[PDB]
Amino acid sequence: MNIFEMLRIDEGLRLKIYKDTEGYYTIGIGHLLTKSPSLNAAKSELDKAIGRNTNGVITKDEAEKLFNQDVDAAVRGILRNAKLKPVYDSLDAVRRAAAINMVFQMGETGVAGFTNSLRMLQQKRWDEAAVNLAKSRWYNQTPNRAKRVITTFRTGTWDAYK
Ligand SMILES: CC(C)Cc1ccccc1
Ligand SMILES: [Cl-]
Ligand SMILES: [Cl-]
Numbered sequence: 001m002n003i004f005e006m007l008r009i010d011e012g013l014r015l016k017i018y019k020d021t022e023g024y025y026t027i028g029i030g031h032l033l034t035k036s037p038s039l040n041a042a043k044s045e046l047d048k049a050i051g052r053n054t055n056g057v058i059t060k061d062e063a064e065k066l067f068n069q070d071v072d073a074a075v076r077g078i079l080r081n082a083k084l085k086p087v088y089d090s091l092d093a094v095r096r097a098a099a100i101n102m103v104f105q106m107g108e109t110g111v112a113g114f115t116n117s118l119r120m121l122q123q124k125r126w127d128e129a130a131v132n133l134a135k136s137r138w139y140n141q142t143p144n145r146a147k148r149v150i151t152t153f154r155t156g157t158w159d160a161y162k
Contacts, residue, residue: 001158003071003097007104009161010145013063017042017056021142027056028063030104031070074104081108083115087122095121098152105145106138121153130154 011030017039020026025033025042033045043056050062058066078084078099088099102111114136120129130150133139139146148160 001161003100004067006097006158006161007067007071007101010101010105010148013060015058015060015063017046027058027066029067029070031063031066070104071100074100077108078103083118084108084111087118090122090124092156094156094158095153098149101149101152102138110138126154126156 008029013029014027017025017027017033020030020032024035025039025045027033027046031049033042033049036042039056043054046054046056046058049066050058078088084099084103088096091099114133117129117132120132130153133150133153134146136146139150151160152158
């Protein structure tokens with residue numbers, strides 16, 4: 001298992017514009033296109049991302065290319081974040097993948113309110129962190145996904161994904 005496979009499970013793969021769990025125009029492997037309610041705005045953003053007139057549809061290769069860029073960016077985002085970097089660097093490889101999944105899903109900003117959990121992870125208090133992470137809107141809105149990521153931080157194994 002690895003970060004790509006993990007996310008491919010959590011996000012799925014769709015070749016036509018769709019609305020995510022929050023109702024936002026997305027395509028591919030969880031690539032958010034826009035928070036705007038306009039499908040045209042979404043199609044424009046898609047064309048700009050692909051570099052061609054897609055008409056709202058892409059190929060598997062193009063989806064994977066967006067995915068590669070998005071994963072790279074998430075990691076790069078963590079490393080540039082003074083609050084996140086130190087925690088991430090303290091983690092083992094499996095748990096790093098759980099951290100990337102969360103940023104990928106919610107952005108650096110989305111995980112801004114996770115101070116207490118960050119500290120707990122930094123201190124390697126796994127069960128406690130697991131409990132703290134569950135007290136979140138994230139968990140209440142996407143519970144099956146949150147449970148998988150949480151078990152991952154709790155155990156440091158890929159058990160939730162097998
Ligand atoms: C925001 C916490 C809970 C998870 C996380 C840890 C370290 C870097 C990025 C994410
Ligand atoms: Cl892009
Ligand atoms: Cl879910």
